[PDB]
Amino acid sequence: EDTPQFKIDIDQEKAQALGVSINDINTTLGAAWGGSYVNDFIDRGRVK
Amino acid sequence: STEEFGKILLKVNQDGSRVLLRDVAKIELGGENYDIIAEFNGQPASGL
Amino acid sequence: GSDLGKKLLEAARAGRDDEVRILMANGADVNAADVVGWTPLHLAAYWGHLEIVEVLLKNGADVNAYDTLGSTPLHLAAHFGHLEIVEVLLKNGADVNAKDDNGITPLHLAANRGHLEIVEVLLKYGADVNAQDKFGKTAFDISINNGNEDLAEILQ
Ligand code: NA
C-alpha cells in the first residue's frame, strides 16, 4: 500500500541567487541521507 | 509537460527579472524525428 | 494512539463510509494521528472522501489540526482540487490563511495546481492574496511563473 513520504522542493531561484549549484545540493542530500558508492579499495587482497 | 519545461529557470538578471526556457524557445510535444510520414488511401496514418 | 484510532485512520483513508459510521458510534478517537501527524480528517481531505470529512467534523474533529510540518486538511483539499471538501472545511471554520512551516497557504497550493474554482472560494472566505511564503512568493507570483493566464487575471 502507498505510505507517507517526505517531498522536498529545491527553489532553483534561491539556489542561483546564493550561488549554490543543484549538483552540490542533490549530491549532499543523496550522499548524506541515501548513501553514495564512491569507488573500490583492496582489503587483504580482495576488491571491496 | 511543456508547461514544466517552459518554467525551467535559465538565469536571474541583475535587476531580479527571471529568464525562463519558454523566453528563449518554443516548447511542444513533437516527434523524436520528422523523417517518416505515412498515408493509408490518402488519409493520415501510422503503422508497424 | 488507541485500537479504534488506528482503525479510523485506515477507514478514513480507504473511504469506507459504513466502517467510519460504526467507529463514530463506538467513539473511535477523531484526534488520532499517525507518526507524520495526519488525523482522519487530513487523510479524508487528501484522498477526497467528502462523506467522511462531513461525518468527522460532526463528531468534533479539529478542522485546523496540523501535521509535523504545519499542514492542515484545507492545505491538502486545496492542493488536490477537492472543491466540495474545501467549501465544507471553510464552512466548519478552517483557517483560510493557515501557514505551514514553509509559509505556504491553501491559496499558494491551489494557485500552483491551477484549481480556479478553489482559488475563488478561498478568496470569498477572505484568503490573504498578498500572503508571502518563505521565498517572498505570492499566489500571483506562482500564476505568472506557471504562465496561467486565467488565474493571473483573477488574482488582480
Ligand atoms: Na543534478
DSSP 8-state assignment for residue B22: G
Domain that holds residue C35: 1-156
* Alpha carbon distance C62, C41 (integer Å): 8
DSSP readout, B13-42?
-TTS-EEEGGGSS------S-S---EEETT
- Contact at CB, A14 and C36, closer than 8 angstroms: no
Task: Count other C-beta atoms under 10 Å from residue C76's C-beta.
Answer: 25
- Helices (H), ranges, chain C: 3-14, 17-25, 40-47, 50-58, 73-79, 83-91, 106-112, 116-124, 139-146, 149-154
Residues in C closer than 8 angstroms to A13, CB to CB, are 135
C-alpha cell at A29: 542530500
* Alpha carbon distance C55, C61 (integer Å): 9
* Alpha carbon distance C107, C118 (integer Å): 8
Q: How long a stretch of residues is chain C?
A: 156
Collapse the DSSP code of B10 into the 3-class scheme (helix H, G, I; strand E, B; otherwise coil) and give the result. Answer: strand
Number of domains in chain C: 1
Residues in A closer than 8 angstroms to C103, CB to CB, are none
C-alpha cell at A5: 513520504
* Alpha carbon distance C83, C120 (integer Å): 10
Method: X-ray
Resolution of the experimental model, in Å, one decimal: 2.5
**Residue B28 CA to ligand 1 centre (angstroms):** 23
Q: Which of these, C108, C61, C128, lies nearest to C89 by C-alpha position?
A: C61
Q: In b/e form, how buried is each residue of C20-39, taking b as 16+ CB within 10 angstroms?
A: beebbeeebbbebbbeeebb
Is the distance from CB of C27 to CB of C17 less than 8 angstroms? no
